[PDB]
Design an enzyme around this catalytic site. Structure first.
Site, PDB file in Angstrom:
ATOM      1  N   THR A 153       0.803  -1.221   0.000  1.00 32.75           N
ATOM      2  CA  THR A 153       0.000   0.000   0.000  1.00 32.75           C
ATOM      3  C   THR A 153       0.838   1.274   0.000  1.00 32.75           C
ATOM      4  O   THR A 153       0.534   2.177  -0.795  1.00 32.75           O
ATOM      5  CB  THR A 153      -0.970  -0.032   1.190  1.00 32.75           C
ATOM      6  OG1 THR A 153      -1.993  -1.004   0.948  1.00 32.75           O
ATOM      7  CG2 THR A 153      -1.613   1.329   1.406  1.00 32.75           C
TER       8      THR A 153
ATOM      9  N   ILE B 290      -4.936  -4.008  -0.330  1.00 35.13           N
ATOM     10  CA  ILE B 290      -4.528  -4.329  -1.693  1.00 35.13           C
ATOM     11  C   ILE B 290      -5.102  -5.661  -2.151  1.00 35.13           C
ATOM     12  O   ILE B 290      -5.073  -5.965  -3.349  1.00 35.13           O
ATOM     13  CB  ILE B 290      -2.993  -4.333  -1.818  1.00 35.13           C
ATOM     14  CG1 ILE B 290      -2.370  -5.230  -0.747  1.00 35.13           C
ATOM     15  CG2 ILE B 290      -2.448  -2.918  -1.735  1.00 35.13           C
ATOM     16  CD1 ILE B 290      -0.871  -5.380  -0.871  1.00 35.13           C
TER      17      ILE B 290
ATOM     18  N   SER C   5       6.256   1.412   5.574  1.00 32.84           N
ATOM     19  CA  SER C   5       5.331   1.725   6.652  1.00 32.84           C
ATOM     20  C   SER C   5       5.542   0.889   7.904  1.00 32.84           C
ATOM     21  O   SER C   5       4.847   1.115   8.900  1.00 32.84           O
ATOM     22  CB  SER C   5       3.881   1.564   6.179  1.00 32.84           C
ATOM     23  OG  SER C   5       3.369   2.794   5.697  1.00 32.84           O
TER      24      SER C   5
ATOM     25  N   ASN D 264       7.139  -6.548  14.445  1.00 30.64           N
ATOM     26  CA  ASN D 264       6.609  -5.255  14.058  1.00 30.64           C
ATOM     27  C   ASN D 264       5.155  -5.125  14.510  1.00 30.64           C
ATOM     28  O   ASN D 264       4.632  -5.956  15.258  1.00 30.64           O
ATOM     29  CB  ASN D 264       6.756  -5.059  12.549  1.00 30.64           C
ATOM     30  CG  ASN D 264       5.944  -6.048  11.748  1.00 30.64           C
ATOM     31  OD1 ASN D 264       5.880  -7.229  12.078  1.00 30.64           O
ATOM     32  ND2 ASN D 264       5.318  -5.569  10.684  1.00 30.64           N
ATOM     33  N   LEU D 265       4.498  -4.054  14.063  1.00 24.23           N
ATOM     34  CA  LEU D 265       3.097  -3.842  14.405  1.00 24.23           C
ATOM     35  C   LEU D 265       2.201  -4.907  13.784  1.00 24.23           C
ATOM     36  O   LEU D 265       1.170  -5.262  14.363  1.00 24.23           O
ATOM     37  CB  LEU D 265       2.665  -2.443  13.964  1.00 24.23           C
ATOM     38  CG  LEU D 265       1.187  -2.064  14.043  1.00 24.23           C
ATOM     39  CD1 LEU D 265       0.746  -1.885  15.484  1.00 24.23           C
ATOM     40  CD2 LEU D 265       0.935  -0.804  13.240  1.00 24.23           C
ATOM     41  N   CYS D 266       2.574  -5.425  12.618  1.00 23.80           N
ATOM     42  CA  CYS D 266       1.828  -6.496  11.973  1.00 23.80           C
ATOM     43  C   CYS D 266       2.333  -7.879  12.362  1.00 23.80           C
ATOM     44  O   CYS D 266       1.778  -8.878  11.895  1.00 23.80           O
ATOM     45  CB  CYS D 266       1.877  -6.329  10.452  1.00 23.80           C
ATOM     46  SG  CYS D 266       1.323  -4.712   9.867  1.00 23.80           S
ATOM     47  N   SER D 267       3.370  -7.952  13.197  1.00 19.15           N
ATOM     48  CA  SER D 267       3.831  -9.204  13.803  1.00 19.15           C
ATOM     49  C   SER D 267       4.330 -10.199  12.756  1.00 19.15           C
ATOM     50  O   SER D 267       4.117 -11.407  12.874  1.00 19.15           O
ATOM     51  CB  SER D 267       2.733  -9.828  14.667  1.00 19.15           C
ATOM     52  OG  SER D 267       3.193 -10.994  15.324  1.00 19.15           O
ATOM     53  N   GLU D 268       5.006  -9.696  11.723  1.00 23.72           N
ATOM     54  CA  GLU D 268       5.614 -10.587  10.741  1.00 23.72           C
ATOM     55  C   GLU D 268       7.045 -10.224  10.373  1.00 23.72           C
ATOM     56  O   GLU D 268       7.734 -11.064   9.789  1.00 23.72           O
ATOM     57  CB  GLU D 268       4.757 -10.650   9.464  1.00 23.72           C
ATOM     58  CG  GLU D 268       5.295  -9.904   8.253  1.00 23.72           C
ATOM     59  CD  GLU D 268       5.068  -8.411   8.327  1.00 23.72           C
ATOM     60  OE1 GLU D 268       4.201  -7.979   9.111  1.00 23.72           O
ATOM     61  OE2 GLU D 268       5.742  -7.671   7.583  1.00 23.72           O
TER      62      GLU D 268
ATOM     63  N   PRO E 146      -0.030  -8.961   6.366  1.00 23.45           N
ATOM     64  CA  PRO E 146      -1.487  -9.148   6.243  1.00 23.45           C
ATOM     65  C   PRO E 146      -2.057  -8.768   4.883  1.00 23.45           C
ATOM     66  O   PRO E 146      -3.024  -9.402   4.441  1.00 23.45           O
ATOM     67  CB  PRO E 146      -2.054  -8.257   7.359  1.00 23.45           C
ATOM     68  CG  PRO E 146      -0.909  -7.431   7.852  1.00 23.45           C
ATOM     69  CD  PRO E 146       0.319  -8.218   7.588  1.00 23.45           C
ATOM     70  N   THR E 147      -1.493  -7.767   4.207  1.00 27.11           N
ATOM     71  CA  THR E 147      -1.973  -7.296   2.901  1.00 27.11           C
ATOM     72  C   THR E 147      -3.471  -6.980   2.947  1.00 27.11           C
ATOM     73  O   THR E 147      -4.297  -7.605   2.281  1.00 27.11           O
ATOM     74  CB  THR E 147      -1.673  -8.307   1.787  1.00 27.11           C
ATOM     75  OG1 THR E 147      -2.749  -9.246   1.684  1.00 27.11           O
ATOM     76  CG2 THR E 147      -0.370  -9.043   2.046  1.00 27.11           C
ATOM     77  N   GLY E 148      -3.797  -5.979   3.761  1.00 24.92           N
ATOM     78  CA  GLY E 148      -5.179  -5.659   4.056  1.00 24.92           C
ATOM     79  C   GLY E 148      -6.027  -5.183   2.893  1.00 24.92           C
ATOM     80  O   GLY E 148      -6.955  -5.881   2.477  1.00 24.92           O
TER      81      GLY E 148
END
Ligand SMILES: Nc1ncnc2c1ncn2[C@@H]1O[C@H](COP(=O)(O)OP(=O)(O)OP(=O)(O)O)[C@@H](O)[C@H]1O
Ligand SMILES: Nc1ncnc2c1ncn2[C@@H]1O[C@H](COP(=O)(O)OP(=O)(O)OP(=O)(O)O)[C@@H](O)[C@H]1O
Ligand SMILES: Cc1cn([C@H]2C[C@H](O)[C@@H](COP(=O)(O)OP(=O)(O)OP(=O)(O)O)O2)c(=O)[nH]c1=O
Ligand SMILES: Cc1cn([C@H]2C[C@H](O)[C@@H](COP(=O)(O)OP(=O)(O)OP(=O)(O)O)O2)c(=O)[nH]c1=O
Ligand SMILES: Nc1nc2c(ncn2[C@H]2C[C@H](O)[C@@H](COP(=O)(O)OP(=O)(O)O)O2)c(=O)[nH]1
Ligand SMILES: Nc1nc2c(ncn2[C@H]2C[C@H](O)[C@@H](COP(=O)(O)OP(=O)(O)O)O2)c(=O)[nH]1
Ligand SMILES: [Mg+2]
Ligand SMILES: [Mg+2]
Lengths: 14, 683, 683, 14
Positions: free
Chosen positions: C148, C579, C164, C375-379, C575-577
């Site tokens: 994104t 897109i 990001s 990270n914030l997305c935990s990956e 996660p690729t929210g």
């Protein structure tokens, strides 16, 4: 909160 | 119940229709003989005590090494030669609970009053034995009291900073806001109160690099600073105290004031952040004529003129702001804003009121900058320059952030010793030493301004005590006559000592040549008006003491023109909260709140009569709330005309007085030349 | 009501017992021919369009200046030659609402899908026309989707950063905490999500320079960071998002978890700050044996050993910490802590769970550092070195703060085109270019680690979509076989591209020689174990595409040993929210949550069937809540063995299952080699 | 809230 009273002029002059 | 606590409690027991004021001498004697002498660590000789203190990380070896042990022994002899006795139990209790050096487990007492005074004097003298003895005589006679940071921390290895008042300018940028938060936390860590100017920050709903309506305003920064001060809580010892100042013409002024309402939302309310409002004469003029006023978005003004809104004179620029279509503004009612200010001060004592044009019409360093805001105690009024903290890789543009050293003359002891000149000059020397020895490694603007301006604050205290013990009412014209003469003499001798220091060191403060001292405009009212007492009773108080005349002021003006001035700022009257008990003095130049002070320490309640209170002078110790606030304004304005910085002016209000009454007091203070108003205390 | 959303709502109107899935094609057709073509700005020629966009600050002139306009025209022809059509209304709606360029007043539409793809491709190619055409083919075929930030901002003038995700290490100092707050606000201002490691911070009740019980713990820093992220919210359109990570052996772990409890007070609870817990294998072992575990005070460990607790191996130093009298420890029940974690994830979805020994037993750069937080997305799972931010006058020791560029392969479109190798290599090149063009000038450690590590994250999506559209159940062993082969091939070609880039540029990532790629230990399971599909159904899916064997992996290992690797990390499955809608793909490699997704945008309700959903594959699109989380763990662990970084693993829980079931899922994930667990989503 | 059920010893082996 004691008591709100407006400034009624002549309070800016001494 | 301790024996001294019982004896102190017998003051309220009325015998023969009068308070037993003599019980406090018995109370302090019992306190000493039963607790202090038992809990005071004693050493066979002073050498053993000094060695124990330096080697156990209590003192600093650097300042003590400047003297041979014989000189230190003679200094301690001078301190103990006075045989100083605390007159009241509360004086000794406050000293031995707040300032006396204790063991690392806070169980025993290492320092007596004489030991603390000797150490402070030896630190002040910086290697001079005669100067150290002079400081010992000045402090053991209780003519001069160094501020709580200086008195508590001087000569201590595990000490905080000797300065506790700092004033930071915050620039309108995220880099500068983050740096302001960092510096606020660093200074609160040192134990100092931090004041922040938020007037340069753009208001809520302003554009951030082409993204309109993106700024949270000064309230987001207020929340950040409140949490920063809550976190930097002085190692969990004393709550972190900070202040935020906003110009009344700032657009966020209403949001700024709403942070102190009792009904404020938790996402708006700030708890540990005091607020002060800066009011130019333009706002008072608009409210006087009931014309609808405008608050301006600072970033629009900065974009239009290239200068910050608080960097410009609102008196001349207000009409240009209003008539400029590219400057964004919202209509306000200045009288409604004044009433809101009075209501907020009645409810919570906030905000502080700083009359911008009262400060700057007599400011001696307007060439450096105008005074835009004050400190947490509303008495420091100095020129500041905002710093441009750039990105990490770039070089920052360091400005000037205010930080001055505090000291208080005891008016009663200085007056009884007839030593205004000597006490003022020695206090100036000590404050200068504190200024030079202060180096703060995480506030570059504070450090730069301390090195350049060399500003000090020499206050006074025990004004009401001295007046009431001399049969003079605080509101009387004779009291104002004494204040006029005394503070004229204090200003004269502080200017003389500053010029003498400049001559000795061959250097003045930075940008002195543009000051009113250099041009002689400062001395106009002193070379034109005579400030000798107009009353025979007051003139008798100064017997045996040379009151400077017009010719003396002309000589001082010539001396300052020839040799310069070492301190940009010299005099500021701080509240002097806890050191007043130790000195047996009334706090600052304010009148006493209560005749006898009732306080509870631990589970035992204590009674503190005002110093010198008796049956003969009972009614001269008139309580501040019973006083006419107009006459208190008159007194403070009489003092303010000889103080280059401000005075911590607390309003003492009754519960029956209206919002209109508080507004009238504020407007009369503005009319009389009052620079700042500290607190609205209601009974 | 809009015609297109009225047509889109006819999907749920069941005709002849079936959903009208074909209405979404009519819905998107109506959407275009009634809104998009009307609101699209159309120019006479592409030259006028590009000149208009460059002149009015929509594009960047620098990247468009590397191509002659004939080359740009050829690129745009290549984009429009495909004649791409959005298969669903949601795809086009999401693109033209989130990523399509709009006029400054958000009124009309400047970019189509082809225009955005062409601009992103010309940005990626950096002057190469053939490479730009290759990128155009890759994205217009929707084989690869830039993240994104990159897809949204590539080639735009007034843009945020293309990265990001940022990970910050906070040292145990006030200077470092202030710098962490500043950097967090700077990166949130850029639009990035910031994760912070709070394990090095000393716990509550620790000494700050020999005054005890002075530190407020990690919760005070948590409140500071929460307010810093609330302040830096970018107009509030996307509020500042932060994550805090704490090792489970930190003493403040219980207070760290109590910030997410529903009954938490306003003086403790953090709202904008996600929380993650790093769990070493020692904690799981202690809970398994029902023994008494100990949480430790980090400052005591640092004082005793000279290293931070999280910089040490807990599986080898836990007993030493417990036996050390100078280390301060608190007794806890590890099973009670696990139950509290499960309850907190059930009630709020927090904390993120990182299995530290699962990350570090396969971590390729343990010589640089062990992975201590996500990270914030935990990956994102990369080595970090903490910085030492000193006083203002002193130089700072800059460490390594993690940041990687995200990009997702579309498994369905990549497998349809039989282009795993070309897509992986081109995506690696694009991510390398994004890393090279990223320059954060307010986060020194992020800058240094981006220059040194050159880490990228190449993820995948549409795994469940591809499996369901190929008649394969997500929980089936055939699905895991396909994932094994596909992600082994992706890893092979990413390593090959990294080695080729290192050979071409003649440089590797910093400290490559100590990595497992240089030693060859990374390739052990690849040169020993064959990852060809074990099922004939899966083997036909890869027909026409070469599957690397053990010999191919040996050749690649020799190539890497002789040329090195350019990227320290290459693959991470985000996660690729949003897109996923544009690409018409299921989100990440996780299973779908709803077969038909119902959303409300403004005052309009619209429905999104899963990509390719029909009656022939209705039951292959099994919802994530209805499937066994053990089989999903098996699938993610099968994928994780070919991913050097982590996978954002969301747990989909029913209301019926207790906290014991969540704990069992977490323990099975830890047993199966799961590195991180993202969310505990409950239906 | 979700029902709290204590972890068994057998929950740690698979
Ligand atoms: N009010 C006080 N202020 C300071 N120190 C006091 C006070 N009262 C008692 N002390 C301390 O207690 C000691 C004992 O004094 P006390 O009145 O019992 O008799 P003393 O030994 O004759 O006094 P002094 O030494 O003052 O002539 C003093 O030497 C002094 O150190
Ligand atoms: N699903 C879609 N995805 C993308 N663009 C679309 C879509 N539907 C319509 N459009 C846009 O609207 C234009 C006209 O659509 P239309 O249905 O008439 O297609 P066409 O190319 O004229 O004909 P056909 O698709 O029947 O061969 C297209 O050229 C395209 O720009
Ligand atoms: C970054 C940011 C700034 N602000 C405020 C603080 C600053 O005083 C002001 C912007 O300051 P800056 O950060 O300096 O803005 P900028 O340099 O990115 O763009 P410009 O200077 O042209 O405005 O907005 C917010 O309210 N929220 C935010 O997230
Ligand atoms: C100053 C300060 C620190 N701290 C905590 C946060 C930091 O992680 C930790 C370290 O503070 P430091 O800034 O390192 O303080 P210090 O260097 O003077 O103390 P030390 O010699 O022990 O290093 O103390 C607070 O909790 N509150 C505070 O006000
Ligand atoms: N003996 C002693 N003197 C102390 C102590 N604290 C302060 N002093 C002061 C008292 C004297 O003024 C000065 C010198 O004391 P000393 O060393 O006993 O001197 P001397 O009288 O034996 O020559 O130090 C202390 O703890 N012990
Ligand atoms: N004319 C035109 N073309 C556009 C626009 N946005 C993208 N394009 C694409 C469509 C074509 O693939 C390419 C060239 O269009 P053009 O400049 O009209 O050229 P041509 O049709 O004369 O060859 O640019 C646009 O706004 N106008
Ligand atoms: Mg700016
Ligand atoms: Mg430290």
């Amino acid at each position: 909160k004691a008591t709100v009273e407006p400034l009624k002029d002549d309070d800016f002059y001494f | 119940v301790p024996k001294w606590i019982q004896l102190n409690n017998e003051i309220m027991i009325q015998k023969d229709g009068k308070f037993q004021f003599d019980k406090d001498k018995e109370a302090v004697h019992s306190y000493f003989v039963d607790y202090i002498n038992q809990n005071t660590v004693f050493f066979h000789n002073l050498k053993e005590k000094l060695d124990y203190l330096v080697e156990n990380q209590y003192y600093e070896e650097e300042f003590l090494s400047l003297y041979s042990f014989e000189d230190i022994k003679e200094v301690f002899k001078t301190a103990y030669a006075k045989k100083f006795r605390f007159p009241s139990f509360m004086s000794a209790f406050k000293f031995y609970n707040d300032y006396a050096l204790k063991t690392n487990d806070k169980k025993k007492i290492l320092e007596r009053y004489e030991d603390r005074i000797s150490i402070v004097a030896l630190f002040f003298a910086n290697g001079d034995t005669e100067k150290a003895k002079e400081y010992v005589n000045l402090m053991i006679n209780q003519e001069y009291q160094p501020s709580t940071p200086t008195f508590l921390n001087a000569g201590r290895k595990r000490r905080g900073e000797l300065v506790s008042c700092f004033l930071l300018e915050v620039n309108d940028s995220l880099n500068d806001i983050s740096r302001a938060i960092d510096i606020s936390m660093q200074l609160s860590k040192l134990g100092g109160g931090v004041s922040l100017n938020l007037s340069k920050l753009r208001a809520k709903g302003e554009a951030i690099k082409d993204v309109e309506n993106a700024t949270k305003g000064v309230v987001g920064v207020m929340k950040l600073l409140d949490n920063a001060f809550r976190y930097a809580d002085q190692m969990g010892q004393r709550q972190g105290s900070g202040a935020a100042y906003l110009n009344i013409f700032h657009r966020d002024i209403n949001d700024f004031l709403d942070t102190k309402k009792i009904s404020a939302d938790e996402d708006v309310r700030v708890k540990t952040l005091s607020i002060g409002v800066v009011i130019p004469d333009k706002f008072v003029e608009l409210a006087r004529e009931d014309k609808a006023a405008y608050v301006f978005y600072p970033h629009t003004i900065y974009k239009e003129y290239g200068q910050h809104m608080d960097e410009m004179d609102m008196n001349e620029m207000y009409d240009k702001f209003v008539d400029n279509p590219r400057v964004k503004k919202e209509k306000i009612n200045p009288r409604k804003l004044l009433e809101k200010l009075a209501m907020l001060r009645s409810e919570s004592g906030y905000p502080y009121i700083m009359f911008q044009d009262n400060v700057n019409k007599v400011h001696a360093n307007n060439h450096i900058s105008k005074v835009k805001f004050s400190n947490l105690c509303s008495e420091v009024l100095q020129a500041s320059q905002v710093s441009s903290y750039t990105d990490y890789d770039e070089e920052d543009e360091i400005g000037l952030d205010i930080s001055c050293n505090l000291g208080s003359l005891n008016i009663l002891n200085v007056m009884e010793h007839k030593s205004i000149e000597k006490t003022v000059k020695l206090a100036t020397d000590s404050l200068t030493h504190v200024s030079e020895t202060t180096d703060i490694r995480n506030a570059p603007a504070v450090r730069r301004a301390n090195k350049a301006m060399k500003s000090i604050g020499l206050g006074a205290m025990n004004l009401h005590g001295y007046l009431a013990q001399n049969g003079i009412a605080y509101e009387s014209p004779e009291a104002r006559d004494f204040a006029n003469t005394f503070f004229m003499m204090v200003n004269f001798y502080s200017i003389q000592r500053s010029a003498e220091i400049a001559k000795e060191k061959g250097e003045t403060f930075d940008q002195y040549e543009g000051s009113t001292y250099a041009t002689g405009e400062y001395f106009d009212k002193y070379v034109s008006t005579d400030f000798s007492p107009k009353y025979e009773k007051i003139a008798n108080l100064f017997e045996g003491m040379h009151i400077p005349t017009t010719e003396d002021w002309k000589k001082l003006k010539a001396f300052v023109a020839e040799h310069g001035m070492y301190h940009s700022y010299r005099l500021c009257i701080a509240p002097t909260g806890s050191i007043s008990y130790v000195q047996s003095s009334t706090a600052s130049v304010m009148p006493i709140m209560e005749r006898i002070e009732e306080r509870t320490y631990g589970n035992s309640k204590t009674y503190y009569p005002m110093p010198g209170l008796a049956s003969n002078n009972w009614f001269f110790y008139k309580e501040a709330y019973d006083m006419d606030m107009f006459k208190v304004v008159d007194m403070i304005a009489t003092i303010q005309q000889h103080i280059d910085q401000g005075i911590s002016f607390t309003l003492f209000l009754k519960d029956t007085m209206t919002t209109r009454d508080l507004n009238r007091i504020d407007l009369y203070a503005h009319h009389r030349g009052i620079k700042t108003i500290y607190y609205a205390r209601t009974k």
